[PDB]
């Protein structure tokens, strides 16, 4: 199977996908995030953050509060299964995590914690 | 004789059968439940749940209140003879139970405890 | 004095308050219920229902027994001073009632009659 | 508010959008569908069909079975809230429908019922 996915954040609080599938024969999974927009990190920051569907809103709430100096992530946040850093115009970043950190049947959400994203700057991640 | 049945729930709150017969020579019996629908488990979850006719309403009622994190079954409900887990679009689960649990000629109902089901989201099971 | 209040029900069995004040100089009082969550009313319904603290338990117990097709309220329940309809995600409802129906020294509770509430899906209303 | 949207179906079983919002003050709403592609209708037809999320699979399935002569829609399908006709390369079709057919608390999908298109040949439509 394939074990990585390419994801674009644009200038309008948007990923170019809202659903990721992780094949369970994969040992590791890799998310390749890039920012094809023109806006700096401070006005249009994007990160890819992975948590349980239950933990999502708590990670985002505390994240937005942490501010830009913390990459919009409450420090030591145990709920974050994996995450890229925050990136702005031009930049890119890749995160790799162990598929054994996941479970079949459990609901996971990927999302961005930069402030201003609607309740739509998110998507599902599924172990199949 | 056969001691298994394949059963499907889809996006219109429907099992694709209303009657199961279990041959008395069976020692175990297996139900293979699948969800060919498009809707995820939290808006159109399906399970397959077995009880006496008398106990059905109470199982369905208490399951309602238990919520999605309990798979819409009240914990430690002794009236549930056997059941699958709750599944959503594209998922599958199988349950196998001992036919010693079922008494000849008695009235057994199978049903789904996810909310929003019609009173007819049910069916009979019987030892033949 | 203000004579209205806005209240939100979310995807986790919760109002965004448990304390309503109705000033005695109000001729009418208005509750604006909105559902910012994402689940339909069949798995995450919210209503705002008002009775005496005395009547609460009986309105709730009978309402869940009345099922989704009755908005989880017993028909012709005289214990209900005022109520919204049951709403799900993306829905809103408003209810306005005469403040006269309220008398000083009486305790009033507002509550939701949907199954699932962790006995904290309630709150006080008092004539100040 | 504007009360129309322009949508293109290409030579790749692909719409050029996945989300449509209909302003609630719109009395009618128009979808202007065009096929800027090269492939003819019987190998790459496109339509725009609207239903509840729940009804979608049945509309797609029953329409598949109905064939090209019927525009890949089962005749007299009451689950179809509105639709264009099937169009091929160089064609265009517009459909105008009553917004009162929509309700604020419902999840609507739009999609194409021509065969071969993936589970991605779809989109959400929401009242706003
Ligand atoms: Cu592989
Ligand atoms: Cu972002
Ligand atoms: Cu046998
Ligand atoms: Cu079901
Ligand atoms: Cu006043
Ligand atoms: Cu509620
Ligand atoms: Cu207008
Ligand atoms: Cu198409």
Swiss-Prot record, chains A, B, C, D:
Major location (coarse): periplasm
Sequence ranges assigned to domain Plastocyanin-like in this UniProt record: 1-128
SUPFAM superfamilies recorded: Cupredoxins
Gene Ontology cellular-component annotations: periplasmic space; plasma membrane
Residue ranges crossing the lipid bilayer per the database entry: none
CDD domains from the UniProt entry: Azurin
Binding site for Cu cation: 46, 112, 117, 121
Keywords: Copper, Disulfide bond, Electron transport, Metal-binding, Periplasm, Signal, Transport
GO terms of molecular function: copper ion binding; electron transfer activity; identical protein binding; transition metal ion binding; zinc ion binding
Pfam families documented for this protein: Copper-bind
Disulfide bonds: 3-26
Compartments it resides in: Periplasm
Function: Transfers electrons from cytochrome c551 to cytochrome oxidase.
NCBIfam families, sorted: azurin
PANTHER family: AURACYANIN-B, OUTER MEMBRANE PROTEIN H.8
Protein name as it appears in the record: Azurin
Gene: azu
């Amino acid at each position: 199977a394939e074990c990585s996915v390419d994801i674009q954040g644009n200038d309008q609080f948007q990923f170019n996908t809202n659903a990721i599938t992780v094949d369970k024969s994969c040992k590791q999974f890799t998310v390749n995030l890039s920012h094809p927009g023109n806006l700096p990190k401070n006005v249009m920051g994007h990160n890819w953050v992975l948590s349980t569907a239950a933990d999502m809103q708590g990670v985002v709430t505390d994240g937005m509060a942490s501010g830009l100096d913390k990459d919009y992530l409450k420090p030591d946040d145990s709920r974050v299964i994996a995450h890229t850093k925050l990136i702005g115009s031009g930049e890119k970043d890749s995160v790799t995590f162990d598929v054994s950190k996941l479970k079949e049947g459990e609901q996971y959400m990927f999302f961005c914690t930069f402030p201003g994203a609607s309740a739509l700057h998110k998507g599902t991640l599924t172990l199949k």
